[PDB]
């Protein structure tokens, strides 16, 4: 996800939990050279990242 650049990791977990209803075992963000922040959030194994992404319209 591009995620708000001022957001931190713990807030991105709490946001995935609320927006997409899924746990994030980890969320290591980077801010892009362009200035957008980019989170790679890894889901808990109990949550598929595939079943969820397609549910997301992706």
Partner 1 sequence: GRFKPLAIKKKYAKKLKQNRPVPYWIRLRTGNRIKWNEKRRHWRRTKLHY
* Contact positions vs RNA (CB under 7 A): 5-6, 8-11, 13-14, 17-18, 25-26, 28-35, 37-38, 40, 42, 44-45
Partner interacting with residue 42 (select from partner 1, RNA, none; CB below 5-8 Å by kind): RNA
Closest CA relative to residue 5, chosen from 41, 29, 36: 36
CA–CA separation, 29 vs 49, rounded Å?
17
Q: How far is CA 25 from the centre of its chain?
A: 10
Least gap, CB of 35 to partner 1 (angstroms): 3
Q: Which two tokens stand for residue 2?
A: 């591009």
**Interactions with partner 1, residue window 1-58 (CB under 8 A):** 31-35
């Amino acid at each position: 996800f591009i995620v708000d650049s001022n957001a931190n990791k713990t807030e991105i977990k709490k946001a995935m939990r609320k927006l997409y209803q899924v746990k994030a075992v980890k969320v290591n963000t980077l801010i892009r050279p362009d200035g957008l922040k980019k989170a790679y959030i890894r889901l808990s194994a109990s949550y598929d990242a595939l079943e969820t992404a397609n549910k997301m319209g992706l």
